[PDB]
Amino acid sequence: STGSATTTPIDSLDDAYITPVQIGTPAQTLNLDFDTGSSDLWVFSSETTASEVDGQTIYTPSKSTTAKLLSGATWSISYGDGSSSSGDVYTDTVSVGGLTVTGQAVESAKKVSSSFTEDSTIDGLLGLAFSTLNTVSPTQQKTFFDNAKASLDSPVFTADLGYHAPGTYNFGFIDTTAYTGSITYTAVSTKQGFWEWTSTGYAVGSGTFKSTSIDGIADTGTTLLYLPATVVSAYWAQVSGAKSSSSVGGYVFPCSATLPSFTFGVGSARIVIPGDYIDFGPISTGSSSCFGGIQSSAGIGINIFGDVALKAAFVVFNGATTPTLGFASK
């Protein structure tokens, strides 16, 4: 089997992308944020505290003939910014892009934090990291991908995120028309449950490539590119007027500035992030200070190749017995 679904930016900055997911029978379609940095499939639901729902589409298990309570199972998760959600668990049929899994654990939120309530466009998250990160207790549950794998033509999924445009998540095959050149594959460490890999270095603009190992995670659920302070400082040094603002929470730059590209290495291959992809717009409406798309990971503990980087590539998440990541230009 295979599946293919379009993912759409939730706003004009590509802050996140949403993909329609069918849950239950008859289908209830929710728009979920596919997140390669977590391993829970959770949704706003008929059980979510009413005051915590503002515009989201909800899953109502009582209206699904295939839903069944997973008795005794609970879940609770926090993300990199401290946002969080928790609840109980149903099993139900879940389809993405034509690919169906029966008995998928669908984690129904009872509680969601303020930042979730405030985003009316995201109905929940679909986690694509390794199932070792799944928060369901007492019996950990598998991801949609881990459940689908044995049915898939090839045990892969691909992310082709667009710049200010829709993209595509494919399951079970590699669309050879979606990229240019070759796909360079690199090793993955699953020791922390993430799609963790090591870039071979970087360049700023037309500058010399600096060969240096940068360990980080491929996280579709993160907007920006988070890299060591050394690397980040070297980037922003090439932008007139750019500075790290403590009050704003990162590097900002004058809206009048033209940004250089940023290149990262994948083996002997190179992925170029255009400068335009690094502009996240005014810090507040009407400001002439803009927020940068490359930021330091120094506060975080890990480097994160989020959407700014990933959208410059065709990315293959190879879930074979020994996982690997592939990157191509597009």
């Binding site: 940095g37 391993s39 993160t222």
Partner: peptide, 7 residues
């Protein structure tokens, strides 16, 4: 907002 999907 920016997003930061689990530590």
């Amino acid at each position: 907002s920016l997003f930061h999907x689990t530590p």
